[PDB]
Amino acid sequence: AEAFTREDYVFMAQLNENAERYDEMVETMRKISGMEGELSDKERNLLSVAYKNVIGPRRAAWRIVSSIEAKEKGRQKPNAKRIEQIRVYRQKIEKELSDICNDILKLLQEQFVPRSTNADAKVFYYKMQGDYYRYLAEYSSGEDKEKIAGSALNAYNSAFEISQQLPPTHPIRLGLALNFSVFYYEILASPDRACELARKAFDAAITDLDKLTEESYKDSTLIMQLLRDNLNLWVT
């Protein structure tokens, strides 16, 4: 008489987040990913939270493991067996880090992006596409790094073009503005474009800071705007 609905699968993803069991959350979200239709603002947030809390603990672990490997290589008399012990272990994490990104980017290219119709939904998928391509480039080297980052820039530029339609004070637009600026500085080795894009987004946010703030504090908003207007007048 009664079968399981979409709201039940959304609730299970919320229960996974409450229990902090994110491995099961990926499995639950994949069931909703297999279902046809466009995800809600709540559902896309749940997809972002689920995958970030799996790659997060493993990215944090990688920065510890690689520093121990850098410690043993920098030693006066290095043990090659202990170096190999860390090196195989690091590559096992690198195998897992690639697997999570391999899971999401396959789903993004085949399911989410071709089905998307909304303007702000398009930006959210292309930002997420750019983010998980960026994580792959964090440990990749040589020709592999350039090939991965090449498809990463294409995803970020596609995200930036649509986000121009969005208001300057939107969390997705600002979230993209942070992640694009990090991508130039940390991966692409371009500090000039990193400082340019982050400033232009920050200047747009101060201009529409009046929309963020209540009408009680709009006078303090205008002084903050005028203080920023002085700093733009200076250093010509």
Which of 81, 143, 215, 233 binds a second copy (CB under 8 A)? It is: 81
Which of 1, 60, 223, 233 binds a second copy (CB under 8 A)? It is: 60
Cα–Cα distance between 176 and 187 in angstroms, integer?
16
What is the smallest separation between the CB atom of 140 and a second copy, expressed in angstroms? 20
What is the smallest separation between the CB atom of 63 and a second copy, expressed in angstroms? 10
57 or 191: CB nearest a second copy: 57
32 or 65: CB nearest a second copy: 65
Map the footprint of a second copy across residues 88-147, applying CB under 8 A: 89, 93
Map the footprint of a second copy across residues 21-40, applying CB under 8 A: 21
Alpha-carbon Rg of the chain, whole angstroms? 22
Tokens in use for 142?
A: 């040589």
Q: Is 12 in the site for a second copy (CB under 8 A)?
A: yes
Q: Is 57 in the site for a second copy (CB under 8 A)?
A: yes
Q: Is 65 in the site for a second copy (CB under 8 A)?
A: yes
Reported as type and span, the H/E element at residue 201 is helix 191-207
Cα–Cα distance between 236 and 1 in angstroms, integer?
72
4 or 234: CB nearest a second copy: 4
CB 29 within 8 A of CB 12: no
Q: CB neighbours of 204 closer than 8 A, spacing ≥ 6?
A: 168
11 or 217: CB nearest a second copy: 11
CA distances from 53 to 27, 71, 146, 177, 221 (A): 13, 28, 27, 21, 36
33 or 85: CB nearest a second copy: 85
Cα–Cα distance between 70 and 100 in angstroms, integer?
25
Q: Is 85 in the site for a second copy (CB under 8 A)?
A: yes
What is the smallest separation between the CB atom of 89 and a second copy, expressed in angstroms? 6
CB 105 within 8 A of CB 147: no
What is the smallest separation between the CB atom of 69 and a second copy, expressed in angstroms? 10
Give the number of residues written for the chain: 236
CB 128 within 8 A of CB 104: yes
Q: Is 70 in the site for a second copy (CB under 8 A)?
A: no
Where on the chain is the footprint of a second copy (CB under 8 A)? 2, 4, 8, 11-12, 15, 18-21, 57, 60-61, 64-65, 68, 81-82, 85-86, 89, 93
